[model samples]
Target: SFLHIGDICSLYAEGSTNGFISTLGLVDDRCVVQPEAGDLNNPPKKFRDCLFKLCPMNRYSAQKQFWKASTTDAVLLNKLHHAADLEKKQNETENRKLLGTVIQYGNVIQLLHLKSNKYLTVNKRLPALLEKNAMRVTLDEAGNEGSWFYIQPFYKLRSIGDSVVIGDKVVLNPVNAGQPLHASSHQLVDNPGCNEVNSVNCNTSWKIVLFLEHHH
Candidate 1:
């Protein structure tokens, strides 16, 4: 289908001088093509120069002349009017879709233990202790982190000491309040160092889980 049924033509938006209808681009606010290709006017003979290239119109001073040229072709002038309206509608649709990710996925979250169903929260006693060293952390029914803590890809649990590993099983680091920063497992009650029974007795190895699916 490499046949040329008609000559290519230009359509300009109503308000602007340089705005021309894009022939093959998406119908967006910034760029628009005619809804039907058959609707475009045929380019005139003088519109081409010596090299057989389309002669560019002087948009600033040629409005009246261009209007005269375009009005002779009935559907194209109408298509020009219709293009502006379509462009406005396209931009409005795009703006609404832009907010969809932030609105639909959301930022608020609550971390709940799979087995106990207890929510993770900052230990309330830390404020009363007034200790410069790290404070004790516990798993209570409920508590709250500072109201300001927000967002993702920035937070991680860490402890204050050299690395500790046992056999093939690495001991998760202490989950204390204020510390120098080694690595933390966000554990409960005991300050993390090392504890042992055997692989048969407890789930001692650490792993991260998102819990998008039901946890067993």
Candidate 2:
């Protein structure tokens, strides 16, 4: 099945640490790739932090806009998923149309962090904490081009309009830079709990895991 807008999912970093991408050290808005360890039945909190919901760029617009991934604030019980905006809910049909649309390859989109109300961004000037050639990934306020990214399948060359589905291994390329999102094997010295995430030439693959499917 094709990946649709509003689909809750987790990005499983394939090549490097073989972990799920998550936001760490909220004060600094740092991004990291956390490995899944401990009991399978009761996964750790780091794994749970990976879940995110796909949302449309313009909630009310009728155009077929590509979906943007938004982080779910699992830690804060009151602030779960997108906030209930009455204006957004007013037109329920329009909301459904946007959420039901399939996401295509090479589509430029944003990754929004719900708690901070910022977008996933890459600053080329800032070197990654661990990797030598990698750039740091962080959460910054939206409106700049640095937050935008385009999606593509990791393997088997696909056209721009091709639909992406769950379980598909994909690469995310920041619009401001050419490198794809990568998770380095090296861990952070200060915060050794999570692996470093950066935009680099590693060409890592992130497997899409369906956390919560959107019903339309």
Candidate 3:
């Protein structure tokens, strides 16, 4: 029942308003947690885009945007904002090694969007549109500082490298800020149908539910 890399899964947030974290829109793609579907036993087919591939990160060579840019001052107050698709592209081929092994606690990883090829990221400077004291969560193409997150068990019994189980209650936080991934009943103003996802210091427990496995 251990979770593995490349597994298709949905994150069920255990907060005030429980729901599955899903992706929204195309240009300014936002990450939201939609309320639980009718049947708790079955996967929510309506939010299939909510599914994500757990991808590994090479932490050793992982560079933060602030250091890479070599500047401490920026207009967004040291926070990197989500940019349009017109930015220059780096050679992502070198970092394309997909780890299909078991995912261990405290491992730096990326949640790859199944539909848009984007990574789940958070902007620390930008507050959630509908929620106060919370950072906004979005999907981005660049694997920068906000794009990396670390996984840890909700219960501290497990060690750093312990393997994560399917039914385990895990906590995900951005590597840069370490704020827990949070979602509530608040809906986006522009997109009223979806719930708002943010990085907050609250009940950030998430139950891992596997949908599909990658065979290689």
Candidate 4:
């Protein structure tokens, strides 16, 4: 057995809209909703509509919007999921890579090797095997984009762990090391112009491989 993960630990069960998320172990068969790929369109319309209706945001618009994967919905479920307020008078959007994260579950037996009780070695793990960034929001014809914050909210740290049975591999969850992403606490604005322009890269995914993955 494994721990099923969720986000905005505060917004959990209490049904808070600010950062509520539902899906975590989609890599397994636990995720309830599954839609085809072609149906995922602009979810802002649905999210905004739910806000206006005070109807609580779930994946109800899947049939209407064609959202197939709960992983897609889980990423969008959190309020911290907003893109940086680029136009918030600071030009935060300029040359910034919007951070949209989904807590993914994968067979990690191949990626992890035990190093110590408190540490492990994951060779070139994360973002390496992860399905790259999915389309966040639809860009208008004017090249303008929707609002998406970096999702750095303030909250205490939390963690989850797991290992693949009957195999030489293992995995972990919350890869956040107990830090439930708080919009005010975890979000950040980075320089894509300098990092992307020069192709300079760092290994954030290795952290993700060991701390972020979960099993069910």
Candidate 5:
């Protein structure tokens, strides 16, 4: 509903200046339009490039312009404004950074379990520790190493050293007081490493969390 018959022509016209729009000139259906195509003053010739994009041909085979012909298929034919990617990038820029994990076992759990003087004065912060996305991936088909972590559930640490996975039980924030590089910040604690020893078994006193990265 956002576009009408008139909008198509207008788009075809102005698309010439913008390579995105100009590509529409390849559409070969212009002459066969059931109804007469209207001209909104300067709209038609604003750029006649879109037609070539719709049904692109090798006007200059040697010039490499014909390579576009392969792209003009029904599966991919349409005006691609990248609206979704643009909006997603904006939304993700904020939400992506805010996303993370907090494993709250070490500090608070220790305080609850030990009930000793050592476990008191738990950092006012909710979780004992926090870690961001630290997943690494293989890069090549030969396994040379190139991979990207998916944007969801970056905090589920099934195992950090001997600690069991206690996901989302504690509050989560940036692992470092300063900027954490990626979105997958997390904290693990209250396990074998971090305890009421005041040294933090591993939940987060000395910054030495014991864990290994595994392939999922």
Candidate 6:
């Protein structure tokens, strides 16, 4: 409903590590994996489908390490239920502000990891992990610090110092903290130096392409 069911797109990381955006692809057992490859000019068909959805506002509120929400295991069943059940379960007086026109879903749905019961999240240590030539994908088990992604229209151009981001809201510290993800000189760093929203630049801007478009 939210995403075009068959829309296949690539997730072009705003911050390119080694002059290429880290891409997501599939492994055996229906699992999605991000292999550390820096060749954006000619990315494989698997990694391009940036087909994405926003995280639920409540989960973003309840959790701090926002990256967990991006995992396929992150649950949005609560919002998918009937309205009566929703009101009964989470009764509140004050309204939670849904920031920006870009964000439309209230109870943001999530995609689960195809292979495991655990949800999918990015390794906060992606910068270090990439050095070892490993994909930065990780299970959302410990729930400490993880990487979250934002897929948007490709309007902004790529840059070295620009930061990649997911949301426009100032609600969470990460979204508000300029430069949630940093791309510099072939290394995609996380949260460079920024007190507030100073580092949130166009470097992080990304585009999601469908399967055929990428191929055709």
* lDDT (Cα, 0-100) at 66 in candidate 3: 34
Displacement of residue 44 (Cα, Å) in model 5 is 64
The Cα local distance difference test for each model comes to: 0.24, 0.68, 0.73, 0.18, 0.20, 0.30
Q: In candidate 5, what are the lDDT values of residues 1-216, reduced to their tens digit? A: 111111111111111111111111222111111011222232223233222100000012222222243575544333232433344355336433322322222211111001111101222222322422232110111110011111112234422322323112222112222111121112114221111111111221111111112111
Clashes of 4: 29
Candidate 5 minimal-lDDT segment of 10 residues? 142-151
TM-score of 4: 0.14
lDDT of 2 by residue, 1-216 (tens): 777777777777777477777776557778877675422244456555666666444332211111232435455423322333433465355646777678898876566565455667788788877787888788875324556678877888566789987788888887765478888888877775678888888858987777667783
Please give, for residues 1-216, the per-residue lDDT of candidate 3 as tens digits.
888878888888877777788776667677887675522465567666777888876332223433355555676433443222112122233234444588899987788888788888888788877788888788887656677789988998787899998878888978885488887678767775677888888776888888888663
TM-score of each: 0.24, 0.72, 0.78, 0.14, 0.16, 0.33
Q: Which residue pairs of candidate 1 clash?
A: 158-184, 159-182, 159-183
Off by over 4 Å in 3: 36-39, 58-98
Residue-level error in angstroms, candidate 6, position 194: 25
Considering summed lDDT, which 10 consecutive residues are worst modelled in model 3? 82-91
Residues 25-133 of candidate 6 have per-residue lDDT tens digits of 3431111223344235666443433233233222333333332345443345333334434443452221222212233212222222322323334443343243343
lDDT of 3 at 160: 80
lDDT accuracy of residue 26 in candidate 1: 20
lDDT (Cα) of model 4: 0.18
User: Model 2 residue 78 lDDT?
Assistant: 33
Please give the distance, in angstroms, between residue 185's alpha carbon in candidate 3 and its true position after superposition: 2.5
Q: Compared with the true structure, what per-residue lDDT tens digits does model 1 show for residues 33-126?
A: 1222222143223221101101111111122233345366767766655654464456346533432122111122222222232322333345
TM-score of 3: 0.78
